[PDB]
Design a protein around this ligand. Sequence first.
Ligand SMILES: Nc1nc2c(ncn2[C@@H]2O[C@H](COP(=O)(O)OP(=O)(O)O)[C@@H](O)[C@H]2O)c(=O)[nH]1
Ligand SMILES: Nc1ncnc2c1ncn2[C@@H]1O[C@H](COP(=O)(O)OP(=O)(O)O)[C@@H](O)[C@H]1O
Lengths: 332, 340, 318, 238, 322
Amino acid sequence: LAQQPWVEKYRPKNLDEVTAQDHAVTVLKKTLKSANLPHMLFYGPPGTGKTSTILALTKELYGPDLMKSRILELNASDERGISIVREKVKNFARLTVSKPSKHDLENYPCPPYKIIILDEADSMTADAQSALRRTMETYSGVTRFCLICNYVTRIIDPLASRCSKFRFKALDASNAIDRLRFISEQENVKCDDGVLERILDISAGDLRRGITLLQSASKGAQYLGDGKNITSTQVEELAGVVPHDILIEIVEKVKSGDFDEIKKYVNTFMKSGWSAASVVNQLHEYYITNDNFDTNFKNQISWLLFTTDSRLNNGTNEHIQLLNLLVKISQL
Amino acid sequence: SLWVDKYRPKSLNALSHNEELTNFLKSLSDQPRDLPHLLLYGPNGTGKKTRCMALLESIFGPGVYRLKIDVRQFVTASNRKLELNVVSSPYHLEITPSDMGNNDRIVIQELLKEVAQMERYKCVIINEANSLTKDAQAALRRTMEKYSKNIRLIMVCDSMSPIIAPIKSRCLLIRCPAPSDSEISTILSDVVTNERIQLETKDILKRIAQASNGNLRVSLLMLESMALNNELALKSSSPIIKPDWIIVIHKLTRKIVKERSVNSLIECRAVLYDLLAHCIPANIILKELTFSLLDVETLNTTNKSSIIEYSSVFDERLSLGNKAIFHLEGFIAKVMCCLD
Amino acid sequence: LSLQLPWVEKYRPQVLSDIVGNKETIDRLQQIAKDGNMPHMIISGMPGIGKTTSVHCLAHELLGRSYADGVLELNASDDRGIDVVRNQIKHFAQKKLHLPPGKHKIVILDEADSMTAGAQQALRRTMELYSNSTRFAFACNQSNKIIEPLQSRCAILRYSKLSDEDVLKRLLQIIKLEDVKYTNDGLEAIIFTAEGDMRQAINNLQSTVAGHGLVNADNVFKIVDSPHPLIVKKMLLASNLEDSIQILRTDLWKKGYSSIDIVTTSFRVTKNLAQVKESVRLEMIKEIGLTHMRILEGVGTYLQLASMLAKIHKLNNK
Amino acid sequence: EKNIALKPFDIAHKMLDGQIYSDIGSRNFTLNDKIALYFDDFDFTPLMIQENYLSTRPSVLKPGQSHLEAVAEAANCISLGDIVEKKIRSSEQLWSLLPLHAVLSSVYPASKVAGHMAGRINFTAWLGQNSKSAKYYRLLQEIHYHTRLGTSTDKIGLRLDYLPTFRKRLLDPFLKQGADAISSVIEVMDDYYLTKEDWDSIMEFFVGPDVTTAIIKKIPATVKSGFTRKYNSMTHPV
Amino acid sequence: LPWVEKYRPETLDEVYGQNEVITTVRKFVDEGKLPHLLFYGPPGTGKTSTIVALAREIYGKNYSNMVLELNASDDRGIDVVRNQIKDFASTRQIFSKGFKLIILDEADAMTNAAQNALRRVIERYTKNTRFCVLANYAHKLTPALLSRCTRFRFQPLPQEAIERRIANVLVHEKLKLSPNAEKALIELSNGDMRRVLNVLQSCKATLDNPDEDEISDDVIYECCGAPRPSDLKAVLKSILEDDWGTAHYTLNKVRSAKGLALIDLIEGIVKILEDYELQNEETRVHLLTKLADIEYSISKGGNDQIQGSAVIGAIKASFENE
Ligand SMILES: Nc1nc2c(ncn2[C@@H]2O[C@H](COP(=O)(O)OP(=O)(O)O)[C@@H](O)[C@H]2O)c(=O)[nH]1
Ligand SMILES: Nc1ncnc2c1ncn2[C@@H]1O[C@H](COP(=O)(O)OP(=O)(O)O)[C@@H](O)[C@H]1O
């Protein structure tokens, strides 16, 4: 069968199918009306439609047949380093431009340049970005670069000045939930009430991660029998999210303040296999956004959680770090 | 052979604990063609490798257990000639790329490309996936994308946190909690009935399960050791047998608690040197020492809080250092100062 | 127009007696040159101290006229490839060249620790095959990274950073040979700037002589590209944190000085603060080194320098 | 020639002297001199300082401070210096951090525990222990390679969990049954492809009350001769 | 054509100062003690003008035969540039006896291996070839290359000179710039004229009417991709005055909608907090230490939301000391 990830399967085909990015789509349409396409810089929250919009613009520029030959898609973060990305760009640019057919010429403008798309460009180092700017300058005649990133401020000024910048607003919760609901109905995914909302909350509004999690949950539902509905516990299990009941129990154990009880609970918690980083993140979310704690408690707990997260990021023993974090909070 | 290996379940039907996971694996094996990439995470000695082998047996057959071991030689950059022990079967492969240190990415790439070219599909089991370098994980993601047609990865790790998000998105997260004490007691009861071991009461199995802290492998080996010492007749008064390194660490904890001085620190250094030289990992030593110190009944809350804080600090330092004895001695000295 | 002969190149050591530091290693090399029959040796030490220069002087003493073709220098981490440099070594070893009976051809390898297993074994085999006429000298930073079979065949020599006395002696010799007008404070400033770096000290001396003619502290500091030690001392010893941050912002960050230069000059100045107790100096040095390590890891921002100043001020007030 | 090996001893003895850290002694022997002392034989100075900093009688103790607090601070600084050294000697090649490593590993702990050497300056034992650990890790890797097809564990798990039971199944029967247990021991070895060399290596991994040197020595030579003769007289799986 | 090449200082007159470097190199040449020179500093200070003036003075009519001008950022490759250097060194002329000068612009862009190879080439051809190395930052070069090259530092241009050059560019290109936009551009460029020219050219291109429209500060900040001071001030005010929930929401919303990285937000907030009048030194000590720790942890990865809340808590806790 034609198995395909739901993220790429449900990408909008044309610019008119982008839902909430009115400003960026309008500016891109105005630029497309002009015969000249400048270098583009797409920035905004993750999962807003940057890649979808650039692919739709490429489709409208070239045609479904020519766009595959005229496009090189790279990920500067997942790649080995600067050398691989820049050599691939050089090889793509040096390659002869594919000749459009009569149908492509008579149906689409088919501009004489090829578009190179970089994903997660902000993750590049300053030297990598300077090398990318030099490569763009060298081959600016026949290639136009579109940089996709989450933070425009992570891109150096010399590279950013060469690119016209388009800002994508964060998707509204209603729009994201409607998109997820439409995707689920088309794929015949039985979802219980609040499952899509839970998926969006876990993904933190990232529609890409939400669609990926929905597809993963659908696959799991096939394996489990009885044809039952997908429930929030299943998506929490698939996303590696500790259940809220365990978090409440951790909070109560911290509140009681007994060192031995906290140590015993952490010992019995590590046997369940739940990730310690997820516990730290959920504890941060619970405590910071809680109206029952005063300013001083949150001031101390923010530093405590920051220290625990920094120590966990170094590849340490989760049990010791979690026990230390829970003991320190109970003393506040 | 040892009872831990003789009575290991060789099929999905032979599993006795975590029935939901067994049902999930049985459902997975019913559709071999669309088998996803798997990532199993949980505490050590809970049965992850056994479950992976049982799933492989359910998919391919009993021939997965006909295992042969070979050494593959790889010529890397600057002509570094490497050896990797690859446990292979006519249906699957098992690798531990973390044994190659920082050269895991190139070994993974070369071997996975070779396996894909040699090929419905061949399953590759990667042990200690959490200890793979990030470059190795990126190479694994690349091989997953390129060779998903002929390669199905089954990654086993104790914690999924070091795993990168791109790997998690393309793999099925499977959580394997440690068995409860009742399930461990049932397994040990089956083992002792198979081996015809006399029991004064069933509470001995409960004590063994409690002493193993949910580690099924440790519980089985402890039961075998206790049975051998008691002439195949376990009594209610039979002491729980602990490994040599655990006994040494407990003795060190008692010594640290009893006397806090520079000479005691020197003798603790000697004990730590003895432990490290005999293939006891530094992180294991630190964790065991910390959790033995926290179990002393003569220490108050302040002492235990200081101990756990110093343990966290020096665990971070161990993960970022080279010479482990330095950090272990620093932690012991800080604990001695806090107790005094 | 004529030939250009910089002081750093003109006054580089040629004979073994021209080397100032490392008295024990220099004595060993002098003995080896005296009795001939240069054994295979491995010289190890921190990079930049001129390890290859000593063996070059030894080769000059041993061979003399035949130094032009009897000595081959190569880098083990050459971009051309390990195979091609091994082939070049083999071609040099097989090259026929008449020599006095008590001398042998010398092969000098730089960054030998970068070689991995297999390459080192092949080099050991090549050395054993042609040990009758060719001797090998390996220069590396970490001697432990060289395989045991190579270490056993070779004699280990350890090279260390030059002390301030050796730098002062070399500078005085150069000044006497060049009739340079100088003051004691100027030489003190030059030695302070160059922490055992003989080449940097000679370059700074030459630049000071050319720019101003008289070598004093003011002219040396004007020539030296590092931040002025007086400014760094004022920043470190300021009683008020606002004053320290203002001095930093106005005089070091806005003057184009990089964070690396700032932390290096702070480390140099703190060592010589005789007015401060050594315990406080050690605490300040620890903080400066921590921020230097943070900078070398890729942060290198102004906020790190501000935090370093804040911690130093916190230490000062006790 | 022996002066080269004596140099780290002299450096460690001089750096741990409490006279050069007093107010008067600091002026005569400044911090630059101590950093230079580090930079003479910088390979062994941190090791010697870490080895010998617990053998002093501190004369530089602050009021209200005990010897144990000083050694704790010295150990903290030593571990920080070890982290710095790991960062220096890695592929990053951060050789500009050598003075920082000097201060963190040699000078600061010495300042903390400076005094009179209560005993003798001992050479660092970390090198021999590191070599011993490497040898035992190679032996454990060989044993794990031999027994991988029978045991479901990694190398560390094999050391921590399997080895005590292997000791109970391979050495304990000789103590109670003598030569009558040779067949059972060989049968257990055959199930895991364990050679006699592996049997010898396994008994060397035990510490504390489980040491087997005296126990093996106490075994009659006839029992060992019969064991090796029976092992050599039959073929084994491979 | 790029505006960087235009208005470039072509002679020593266009250079604001730094005649000391010219005089020292002239004395080196006269005395026969010319070393391998390394000129580093911000672009536009006059390194290229100084070196070409020195070469023209030394050689004269045979400038094209005795000078090789190379740019290390051309990205052609290590082998090709090494071959170029070797064939330039080997093409000795009897009628043109004398050392040959090689100029390498933007050498800091090279990789470490390329820099080591360049240093080896410099050592090999030091008998008859003199190397001049141009870089933006000296700390980016390898220590092996730095030791063999005499270092000359070019100080950043004074603000008055930058303003004069900006006014000259504006009157040449008929561009009208707001004073606030000029201040923002000068602050962002940080003494680099290349950034000024590039940003001005890009802003002129983006203008709908590049002849009858004035560039605002918002346009400059959008072109440079830099955090606007208004957003940072709003975030700081929300953190200092509002409660924890409001501060957290404001910080997340501002730094996600505007695409401001947490490290850049920290840098901007630290820059703003410099001008604050604090009655207690402990406030500044805690602020600096905690913010530096957070930034260093950010450089290694970690949880983004946790680090943002850590920033909020660090700022809130320090100001409790007034
Ligand atoms: N009887 C029985 N034994 C089990 C079961 N699961 C695990 N074990 C035992 O647990 C031991 C260790 O499991 P292991 O494969 O090492 O799991 P892992 O190391 O955590 O991935 C094996 O030797 C098995 O004998 C089960 O369901 N039933
Ligand atoms: N404005 C939008 N309208 C419809 N779908 C969207 C929109 N934005 C994102 N999506 C969905 O997100 C998925 C891919 O997101 P993507 O564009 O890759 O995120 P990013 O913005 O990080 O590139 C697509 O399947 C698409 O359906």
